[model samples]
Target: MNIFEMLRIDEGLRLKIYKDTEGYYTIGIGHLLTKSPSLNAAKSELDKAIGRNTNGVITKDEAEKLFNQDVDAAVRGILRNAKLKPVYDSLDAVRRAALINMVFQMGETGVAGFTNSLRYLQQKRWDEAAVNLAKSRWYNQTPNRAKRVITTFRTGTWDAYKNL
Candidate 1:
């Protein structure tokens, strides 16, 4: 299934999605978490929004208002620039969405910090990707959530407590 289909959101998540869009698509656990009681709800909303905005096609004015910057225009501008196409083309939908979600939470430079992890992912080196993911400061900061995502990546399931 496609990424969007995989992340099919429920009404609670839909509310979060509406808030996130209204908030200019900024990514953060607190921002997302504040909207939903369950972590899964927050993740679902983020996944759905990112999946819908792939290919840099959709843009939000609310995001511009929140950041005092034209996010949509900037995204469109970057996508239109021929020099940036290689980076865009190299990503699969899942990886692309992951990176986008990461960037949304961590900012461009923060996401760029995943240089090694991105390389491992491009190579489909799942173990290396998981290792790289575990090494991040964010991972240290949110061990449970980080572990959950890494487990999901490694096993295609959200069995974070399982000692695979």
Candidate 2:
């Protein structure tokens, strides 16, 4: 399934497609909400959050707050316990968070399905990882988004991108 499918928001998030009090939107990963008015805003907030706390170690409070209890435990479970160390043991916290955010947004099955990318991760190949990530079906479906995410995943930097 695609990211929207994984997030179960084909019609859009239940919390409305508009921004919250903090000017964030309830989008991606079960309304694992972020403070941005648009997709770019959401991604920017997510990038900042991930950058601040790497190691794939999201706090319980964060898990509870961002995801909320409305979503299924199974979904929250996956996000809470993403396999960061296996592929990114040596990566910094920021890199790990970006990867986790990608995996959380995409789901493990879809992320793992990127065979070339997975192979690169298996071999600890950074450039190949970025290239493979960019070549996935997700990227093809959303080039701008793919570019932003791939840049972050590849270079450990996050910048706003329109249409992503």
Best by lDDT: 2
TM-score of each: 0.45, 0.48
- Candidate 1 TM-score, C-alpha based: 0.45
Best by TM-score: 2
Error of 2 at 16 (Å): 1.8
Candidate 2: tens digits of C-alpha lDDT, residues 56-140: 3344455444454334433443355434345546565545545555665555665645666755665767788888787666777
Candidate 2 regions exceeding 4 Å error are 1-14, 17-85, 159-164
Error of 2 at 80 (Å): 8.9
* Model 1 C-alpha lDDT versus the unseen true structure: 0.46
The CA lDDT of each predicted structure is 0.46, 0.50
Position 47, candidate 1: lDDT: 53
